[PDB]
């Protein structure tokens, strides 16, 4: 008889709300069975009771490490259903803050993985940069993480007059922080022994098990949604896609570090190419008018009233919209019935498929190896449980 | 366009093998990591002296709600219930009636701050800048009931924080 | 920063790079917290004439999906959902890490 162990939810390496039932022979892991739903809030049913604008903060709270990216995916789905187009400056702002959000998420992922394995120091070094990016969020929206800035017509407000300079100041220094992190981890033999050939997944198994993002690219699969199916302005920025060779934790760590570097590159390009113009679609039946117009113009007041009480109507239909979120492929299957409330909203999170395959990746490994494998999948249970 | 992260093999020169052996036997990478930690030890820490020093904020910051007035002292709120209709959490409850002078004013204005998600949709919807999210964020209570705000509490919050709320509005209403 | 020169040399030697060039703390190069007011231009539809809403209303151009092969009712080469994806290029900027 094997030993049966509860790993979490009250466990430092359980990411809060995971109940991993493990069957162990000694310390060898014979079986992993993840019990989830300890953070299931019934988000989709609640969304069915809100208008399209009211449902937006739910996507903030879905993956609370990548907020603007969830907002962007939801907004792209709603724009596709509405047959409208955001203005170019809004698209550049969206891509800039999506890359900043990618930096935030990759910092969180790498530092928490190192903390779980035992390297407690880079967490503190990189969370100061995370704090500065939270300051950027708060300056643009008034909230440190739950901005609700990206809307299904563009963005809520324009950038404050000194924000681009501060973003440039942060970006010209972030590379040295990445360099210090790599000096800490990249060539350390303890880190490599903990990560090399751990959680090895083949390309075919990754494709069949529904993996996406880094979980694919570490196995050598040359795939990235921003390159193959670009959405906002990603066809106007130049960056490189890191590709793994061994399919293990070490290759995924290297891929994430290089993706942080590439996000810095894209942020530079977005900073240089920010255009002028309006920030939300010039269609007052979808985007609210300015406050000065609402207090002067009868049509503007009527449309403000109707947009903030009933909302805009979305023509009947169904869409599946996916983006390259920092954790993989984040998708929304959105069904509208012609009303101002969504009929059905199914959220596809990469964490669901990645966690459904934890048992496969943990075969023939120890307890510490399973901790490393949980860390390398970049799991946030707000999006897994919904 | 893609690049490889881990597709480099090492040189088989005798001297290169000697450096690798010296690194294995003498732990040069671990000394490098210790040096990084030591260099961080002599840097100035990033800690601030709370509560005597505060983290930076912005005029757009969303915090404790308040009900505002016109300069004459009359309440701005006219009980249109736009904030109540837009609230994603259904945290606002409003009851109104004609006032003694016939003005259209609320009799109940409640915000459940344990339901509120602090999104600020209410102050975007409001046509007269009546309800706002203030700059205060240090209002933790010792009981749950203290976080169920009624109209008296919100008007008191407005009267208390107006000198800052108005100045914050002045610096951001041109972006709105 | 306000560090002594010898401490700066020790930090630079321990880290292996020049720390004073890129400080994590922000002293004075940041933007001022009081800014002049903006102007925020208007969108393309703010014209006074030739601006009828029926010419710029995307929501009404949306159509129900076009039915292909309803079941209620030569060569003929095979087809694919799209042309094959092109092979990627190997990073002239930096091909190997």
């Amino acid at each position: 008889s094997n030993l049966t162990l509860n790993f979490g939810p009250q466990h430092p390496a359980a990411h809060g709300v995971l109940r991993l039932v493990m069957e162990l022979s000694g310390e060898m892991v014979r079986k992993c069975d993840p019990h989830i739903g300890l953070l299931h809030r019934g988000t989709e049913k609640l969304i069915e009771y809100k208008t399209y604008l009211q449902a937006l903060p739910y996507f903030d709270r879905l993956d609370y490490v990548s907020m603007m990216c969830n907002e962007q995916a939801y907004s792209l789905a709603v724009e596709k259903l509405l047959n409208i187009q955001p203005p170019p400056r809004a698209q550049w702002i969206r891509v800039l803050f999506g890359e900043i959000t990618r930096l935030l998420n990759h910092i969180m992922a790498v530092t928490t993985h190192a903390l779980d394995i035992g390297a407690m120091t880079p967490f503190f070094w990189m969370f100061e940069e995370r704090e500065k990016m939270f300051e950027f969020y708060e300056r643009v929206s008034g909230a440190r993480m739950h901005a609700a800035y990206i809307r299904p017509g563009g963005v809520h407000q324009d950038l404050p007059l000194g924000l681009l300079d501060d973003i440039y100041e942060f970006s010209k220094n972030f590379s040295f922080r990445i360099d210090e992190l790599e000096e800490m981890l990249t060539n350390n033999r303890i880190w490599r022994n903990r990560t090399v050939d751990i959680g090895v997944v083949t390309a075919e198994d990754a494709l069949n098990y529904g993996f996406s993002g880094v979980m694919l690219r570490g196995s050598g699969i040359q795939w990235d949604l921003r390159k193959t199916q670009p959405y906002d302005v990603y066809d106007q920025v130049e960056f490189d896609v890191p590709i793994g060779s061994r399919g293990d934790c070490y290759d995924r760590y290297l891929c994430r570090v290089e993706e942080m570097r590439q996000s810095l590159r894209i942020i530079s390009q977005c900073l240089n190419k920010m255009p002028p113009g309006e920030i939300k679609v010039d269609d007052a039946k979808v985007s609210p008018p300015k406050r000065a117009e609402m207090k002067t113009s009868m049509e503007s007041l009527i449309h403000h009233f109707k947009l903030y009480t009933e909302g805009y109507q979305v023509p009947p239909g169904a869409t599946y919209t996916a983006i390259e979120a920092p954790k993989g492929e984040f998708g929304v299957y959105l069904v509208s019935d012609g009303s101002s409330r969504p009929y059905r909203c199914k959220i596809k999170a990469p964490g669901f498929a990645h966690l459904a395959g934890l048992d496969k990746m943990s075969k023939g490994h120890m307890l510490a190896d399973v901790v490393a494998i949980i860390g390398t999948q970049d799991i946030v249970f707000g999006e897994v449980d919904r | 366009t893609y690049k490889f992260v881990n597709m480099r093999e090492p040189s088989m020169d005798m001297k290169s093998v000697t450096d690798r052996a010296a690194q294995t036997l003498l732990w040069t990478e671990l000394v490098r990591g210790l040096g990084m930690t030591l260099s961080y030890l002599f840097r100035e820490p990033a800690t601030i002296n709370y509560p005597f020093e505060k983290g930076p904020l912005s005029p757009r910051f969303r915090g404790e709600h308040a009900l505002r007035r016109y300069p004459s002292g009359e309440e701005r709120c006219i009980a249109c219930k736009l904030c109540e209709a837009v609230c994603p959490a259904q945290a606002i409850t409003i009851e109104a009636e004609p006032r003694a002078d016939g003005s259209r004013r609320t009799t109940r204005y409640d915000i459940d701050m344990t339901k509120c998600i602090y999104c600020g949709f209410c102050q975007e919807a409001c046509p007269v800048d009546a309800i706002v999210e203030g700059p205060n964020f240090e209002f933790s209570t010792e009981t749950h009931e203290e976080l169920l705000y009624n109209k008296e509490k919100l008007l008191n919050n407005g009267d208390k924080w107006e000198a800052e709320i108005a100045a914050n509005i002045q610096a951001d209403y041109l972006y709105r | 920063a306000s560090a002594t020169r010898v401490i700066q040399l020790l930090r630079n030697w321990a880290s292996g790079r020049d720390l004073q060039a890129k400080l994590q703390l922000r002293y004075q190069e940041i933007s001022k917290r009081t800014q002049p007011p903006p102007k925020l231009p208007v969108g393309p539809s703010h014209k006074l004439s030739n601006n009828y809403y029926c010419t710029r209303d995307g929501r009404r151009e949306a159509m129900p999906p076009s039915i292909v092969m309803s079941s209620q009712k030569t060569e003929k080469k095979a087809v694919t959902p799209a042309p094959p994806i092109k092979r990627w290029e190997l990073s002239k900027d930096q091909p190997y890490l």
Binding site: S175, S268 | - | Q94
Partner: peptide, 29 residues
Amino acid sequence: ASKVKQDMPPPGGYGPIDYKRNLPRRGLS
């Protein structure tokens, strides 16, 4: 009469942002 004021990059552009990995050799034989 005043012109449009908006948050924009300076005339020309920003200076280059370093992103490539940097690790010096820093060792004896």
